[PDB]
């Protein structure tokens, strides 16, 4: 029952603002102190913010002091982060933390990816990977779609609404040297089911509101 | 202020 | 302030093994002390609190163990869906300090790959790049040579792979080889192939352009 729901994530030039929020689906929210983390890429856990039961007090780290500020809203049972005068510094993975009196942090969130910079927001190009003739050459087959030239991250790849999940890879994004991510996602199926079963790969890119639905299909 | 109020949330 | 230093920093062990993660704190914290569990990309999960007790949810195999300067989180059957780092959290005084972490990796059976070749799309052929992909699949180690053949030459600086992190089941990894050509530079060539070396074996995978 207890849950933590995030949300406001996404691509901010530097120097702006942006307003996070974590909502609890679950408890109360009053009778728990509450924290705000962040991780970096490629870096360890660094604690933020915290906010204790009635929001008359708060804490924040010195590196962060004076940009951040955090509040909270009993009534809605929300607990908002407001960041101004980010920094490329700032961008990491944000999560809201809980806190039991003798227990330590319980539930956290999903995660809200924030990232800095002043770069423009790109579409993914979602090509099909989809052999035929070297691929009847076996009875385990390989389905894939590459995911090319999109920024920023996340993005996130699914197969048949979802209703395929046996066998996928979806492999890290690299960055490449033209500063667009890329990656792909591969799946495994039978080669006697690529003439029954259609196989789609489902790409979701939200910080450009775009989203893929590609049929890979076995070549001419 | 906020560290006395977290330790005695901590304590009981 | 309190500093809180984790030993080792990483780890590697079979399936079913126990294994130990010693926590030293600089100074005096009773019993305070927290075990956080964390997969790569995904929230942290509490583990141990109080620094002997089991939080609801976790599987008995972990335990908790120390006085009041050295404390141990002992795993006693490894298991696959155990692969994450393990942080000890002091909660005596605030700030609420944490150790350096360790890195826990699975060592298992050698696995040969399952490797397939994928060539590019006339889709993004259309767009002047053509992008031939070679996928390693259900090995281990994750050490392994992929070399890029193309009309029986070696190919360099076209390459770019991308590593999959450890399978929660049974601890294999994949590699995606992309190699990035000019339509151009595509045109002028037929035979390409990838080919992949572990140890003594060396499988290759080829394809001719225009086939079917």
């Given at each position: 029952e207890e849950q933590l729901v995030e949300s406001g994530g996404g691509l901010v030039q530097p120097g702006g603002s942006l307003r996070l929020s974590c909502t609890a689906?679950?408890?109360?929210?009053?009778?728990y102190f509450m924290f705000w983390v962040r991780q970096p890429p490629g870096k360890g856990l660094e604690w933020v913010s915290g906010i204790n039961l009635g929001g008359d007090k708060t804490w924040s780290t010195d590196s962060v002091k004076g940009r951040f500020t955090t509040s909270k809203e009993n009534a809605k049972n929300t607990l908002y982060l407001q960041m101004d005068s980010?920094?490329?510094?700032?961008?990491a993975v944000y999560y809201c933390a809980r806190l039991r009196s003798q227990r330590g942090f319980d539930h956290w969130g999903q995660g809200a990816l924030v990232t800095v910079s002043s770069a423009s927001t790109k579409g993914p190009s979602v090509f099909p990977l989809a052999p035929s003739s070297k691929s009847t050459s076996g009875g385990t087959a390989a389905l894939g779609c590459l995911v090319k030239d999109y920024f920023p991250e996340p993005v996130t790849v699914s197969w048949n609404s979802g209703a395929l999940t046996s066998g996928v890879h979806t492999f890290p994004a690299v960055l490449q040297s033209s500063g667009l991510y890329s990656l792909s996602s591969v799946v495994t199926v039978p080669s006697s089911s690529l003439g029954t079963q259609t196989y789609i790969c489902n790409v979701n890119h939200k910080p450009s509101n775009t989203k893929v639905d590609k049929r890979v299909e076995p070549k001419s | 202020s906020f560290k006395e109020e977290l330790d005695k949330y901590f304590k009981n | 302030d309190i500093q809180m230093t984790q030993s080792p920093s990483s780890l590697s062990a079979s399936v079913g093994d126990r294994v130990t993660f010693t926590c030293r704190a600089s100074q005096g914290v009773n019993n305070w002390l927290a075990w956080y569990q964390q997969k790569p990309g995904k929230a942290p999960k509490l583990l141990?609190?109080?620094?002997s007790n089991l939080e609801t949810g976790?599987?008995?195999?972990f335990s908790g163990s120390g006085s009041g300067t050295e404390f141990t989180l002992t795993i006693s059957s490894l298991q696959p869906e155990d692969i994450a780092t393990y942080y000890c959290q002091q909660?005596?005084?605030?700030?609420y300090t944490f150790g350096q972490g360790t890195k826990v990796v699975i060592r298992r059976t050698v696995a040969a790959p399952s490797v397939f070749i994928f060539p590019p799309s006339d889709e993004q052929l259309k767009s002047g790049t053509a992008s031939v992909v070679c996928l390693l699949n259900n090995?281990?180690?994750?050490e392994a040579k992929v070399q890029w053949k193309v009309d029986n030459a070696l190919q360099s600086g076209n390459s770019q792979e991308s590593v999959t992190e450890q399978?929660?089941?049974?601890?294999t990894y994949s590699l995606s080889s992309t190699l990035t050509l000019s339509k151009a530079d595509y045109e002028k060539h037929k035979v390409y192939a990838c080919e992949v070396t572990q140890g003594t074996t060396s499988v290759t995978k080829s394809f001719n352009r225009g086939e079917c």
């Open positions: 689906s679950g408890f109360t929210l009053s009778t980010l920094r490329p510094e700032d961008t | - | 141990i609190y109080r620094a976790v599987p008995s195999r909660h005596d005084n605030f700030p090995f281990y180690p994750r399978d929660s089941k049974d601890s």
